[PDB]
Design a protein around this ligand. Structure first.
Ligand SMILES: [Cl-]
Ligand SMILES: [Cl-]
Ligand SMILES: [Cl-]
Ligand SMILES: [Cl-]
Ligand SMILES: [Cl-]
Ligand SMILES: [Cl-]
Ligand SMILES: [Cl-]
Ligand SMILES: [Mg+2]
Ligand SMILES: [Mg+2]
Ligand SMILES: [Mg+2]
Ligand SMILES: [Mg+2]
Ligand SMILES: [Mg+2]
Ligand SMILES: [Mg+2]
Ligand SMILES: [Mg+2]
Ligand SMILES: [Mg+2]
Ligand SMILES: [Mg+2]
Ligand SMILES: [Mg+2]
Ligand code: NA
Ligand code: NA
Ligand code: NA
Ligand code: NA
Ligand code: NA
Ligand code: NA
Ligand code: NA
Ligand code: NA
Ligand code: NA
Ligand code: NA
Ligand SMILES: [Sr+2]
Ligand SMILES: [Sr+2]
Ligand SMILES: [Sr+2]
Ligand SMILES: [Sr+2]
Ligand SMILES: [Sr+2]
Ligand SMILES: [Sr+2]
Ligand SMILES: [Sr+2]
Ligand SMILES: [Sr+2]
Ligand SMILES: [Sr+2]
Ligand SMILES: [Sr+2]
Ligand SMILES: [Sr+2]
Lengths: 142, 142, 150
RNA sequence: CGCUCUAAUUGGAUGGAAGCAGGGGCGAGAGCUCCUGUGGACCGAUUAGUGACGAAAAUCCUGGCCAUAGUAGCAGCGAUA
RNA sequence: ACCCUCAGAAGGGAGGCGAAAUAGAGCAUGAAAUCAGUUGGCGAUCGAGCGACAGGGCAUACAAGGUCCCUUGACGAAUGACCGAGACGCGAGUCUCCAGUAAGACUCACGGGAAGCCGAUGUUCUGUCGUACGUUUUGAAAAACGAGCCAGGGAGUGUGUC
């Protein structure tokens, strides 16, 4: 009748009262775009970051309004850095034997793009019975 | 013809700039001000010097223009514009909800705001806006 | 060439197309814009009048130096581009002919779509002064047409 | 951090690889990664290597394209047809 | 192929083959600049390094993100009272007490609500700062030099000795 996702889509990991605070900080605070200077002015100048090198550069000089430059103080907490917004830590899977050593109470799983439906069916069922959520589930016609 | 004014102000013997400044402040608060008896308004100082300044503003201009009002009608309306950011969104809406009138088109008498009034018994060196207008080149229509 | 930029239901439609036409692209835009919404028949007679020079085609985007015409409405500049009009007529003739074969009333169908596309140029070269030569090109145009039942 | 090719270990693909388009997640960031569509045969990861390895700029080179513009020219000549 | 159309071995339409014609002839894929048609936003009274950060309008199929608003309550850093009671000052106003109390960012809990709803993307309005970039120069937004745009190309390599 309708489309239903394989697995445990509605799963949440149990984190410490601290990690769950440091995530609710990262989400709240955030960070700026950090796109390259004048990327919007020229089409040949890409969106990917480059250090403003010019001696007179307004972004380099600090001059407020010309964007924020990449610094160490802009990082996210050591504790939460690199966690999926659900709280989960990502584990990249390519085959069924990649699911070994995974804690479904902390680590969720992300199957690669290269993997096909025949092997995806095998990884998805073996991830459900082991208690691990797949972040990119196949949607079946149920 | 018809203007739903919140506040109606009487300019009779009231120091021009000081009235204008309170009318400007109120326009930005969201009030529909209406300055009445502009002909009967006043400006302190030597008549000969106040006239020279106003006569110069009429001589000023080029192909682009610089329209300066001669009638005491608009002279008050332009002084109010000089206290409002008339080139911004907010400042245009506030200015356009302020209109100055010669005499009184209403039935209700206008109020005299605090600190604006001049004491004729204590002063002799001043001018009437209508006296400035007859010297500028207007037609006494009040 | 080009493929039809819009979709259509064969039971209620009739398609037509022009290929690599050596005419003015800029004229083909304005003619297209103007005959959109009109009936294939109302549009035929319109173009027949443009050829004779009775009804002008409003030159809205490509209007530099063009004098104003009185018969234009909502605009000032216009011209009578007869070459492209005659080409557009061949498109409307092919359209009615393809429609009547399917049982449709050709001269009674609305122009759902009409768009001109510049499918390159046919190159040339003109010998200019000082031992130099500058391009002297001709535009190759394609134009689509979809006729719908009202 | 990213690029190429070699070697060891180990993986993914016609149950659809790379590439591209649009969209989601990540890292301060260089980048990384997934989803959808297109595509229809290749593609990774770790380690240790190799280098014709990273671009916005040089009146840079080559190609392609836009504005210029339906604009100047298609009149001037003792041969005005 | 056939049929229709056309002045027509053109082109067009229908149709046929193939997994695929958007594989149909410079015919694998098909980026950018750019063009046409069209969708969302803006728009004929209004001001210009085109944006960064904040915050409102409008717009959004799924997937890959799932949060967000309000009553109330817990916690509660620096900071921090009104009113009132007493006491001073020509005066605006002040001191003492009430009290480092009420309050106070963030975070959390019970209950309640939103799913274009939260994020995010597009556009646009407001606030804030804001005269590109690279180079030359004591000093560059510069009436100092360079580029029309995009793509691809484009500069510490080799041997020998120290
Ligand atoms: Cl770091
Ligand atoms: Cl003037
Ligand atoms: Cl202003
Ligand atoms: Cl006096
Ligand atoms: Cl053209
Ligand atoms: Cl916190
Ligand atoms: Cl070096
Ligand atoms: Mg760009
Ligand atoms: Mg002209
Ligand atoms: Mg020569
Ligand atoms: Mg290995
Ligand atoms: Mg390169
Ligand atoms: Mg550079
Ligand atoms: Mg011109
Ligand atoms: Mg003759
Ligand atoms: Mg091809
Ligand atoms: Mg110098
Ligand atoms: Na004065
Ligand atoms: Na003047
Ligand atoms: Na135009
Ligand atoms: Na007209
Ligand atoms: Na008319
Ligand atoms: Na917005
Ligand atoms: Na230089
Ligand atoms: Na500069
Ligand atoms: Na200068
Ligand atoms: Na050029
Ligand atoms: Sr894929
Ligand atoms: Sr005030
Ligand atoms: Sr134009
Ligand atoms: Sr495209
Ligand atoms: Sr190189
Ligand atoms: Sr051209
Ligand atoms: Sr002649
Ligand atoms: Sr000549
Ligand atoms: Sr066909
Ligand atoms: Sr200005
Ligand atoms: Sr406290």
């Amino acid at each position: 009748t309708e489309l239903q996702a394989r697995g445990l889509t509605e799963k949440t990991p149990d984190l410490s009262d601290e990690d769950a605070r440091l995530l609710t900080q990262r989400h709240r605070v955030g960070k700026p775009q950090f796109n390259r200077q004048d990327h919007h002015k020229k089409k040949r100048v890409s969106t990917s970051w480059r250090k403003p090198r010019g001696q007179l550069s307004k972004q380099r000089r600090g001059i407020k309004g010309k964007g924020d430059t990449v610094e160490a103080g802009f990082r996210s907490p050591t504790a939460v850095r690199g966690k999926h917004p659900s709280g989960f830590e990502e584990v990249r899977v390519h085959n069924v034997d990649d699911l070994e050593g995974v804690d479904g109470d902390t680590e969720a799983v992300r199957i690669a793009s290269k993997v096909g439906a025949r092997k995806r069916e095998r990884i998805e069922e073996e991830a459900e019975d082991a208690g691990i959520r797949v972040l990119n589930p196949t949607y079946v016609e149920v | 013809a018809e203007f739903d004014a919140d506040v109606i102000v009487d300019a009779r013997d009231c120091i021009m700039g000081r009235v204008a400044s309170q009318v400007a402040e109120q326009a930005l608060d969201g009030e529909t001000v209406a300055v009445v008896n502009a002909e009967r308004a006043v400006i302190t100082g030597r008549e000969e010097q106040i006239v020279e300044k106003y006569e110069k503003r009429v001589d000023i201009g080029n192909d682009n223009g610089y329209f300066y009002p001669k009638r005491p009608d608009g002279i008050f309306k332009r002084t109010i514009r000089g206290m409002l950011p008339h080139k911004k969104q907010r400042g245009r809406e506030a200015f356009e909800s302020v209109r100055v009138y010669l005499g009184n088109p209403y039935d209700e008498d206008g109020e005299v705001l605090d600190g604006t009034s001049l004491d004729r018994l204590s002063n002799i060196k001043f001018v009437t806006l209508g006296e400035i207008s007859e010297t500028l080149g207007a037609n006494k229509t009040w | 060439g080009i493929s039809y930029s819009v979709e259509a239901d064969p039971d209620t439609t009739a398609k037509a197309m022009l290929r690599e036409r050596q005419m003015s692209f800029k004229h083909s835009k304005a003619i297209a814009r103007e005959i959109k919404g009109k009936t294939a028949g109302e549009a035929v007679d319109y173009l027949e009048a443009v050829i004779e020079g009775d009804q002008p085609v409003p030159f809205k985007q490509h209007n530099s130096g063009v004098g104003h015409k009185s018969k234009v409405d909502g605009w000032d500049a216009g011209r009578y581009p007869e070459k492209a009009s005659k080409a557009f007529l061949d498109l409307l003739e092919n359209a009615v002919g393809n429609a009547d074969h399917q049982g449709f009333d050709g001269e009674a169908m609305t122009i759902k779509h009409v768009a001109a596309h510049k499918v390159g140029e046919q190159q040339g070269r003109k010998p200019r002064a000082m031992g130099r030569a500058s391009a002297w090109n001709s535009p190759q145009v394609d134009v689509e047409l979809i006729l719908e039942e009202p």
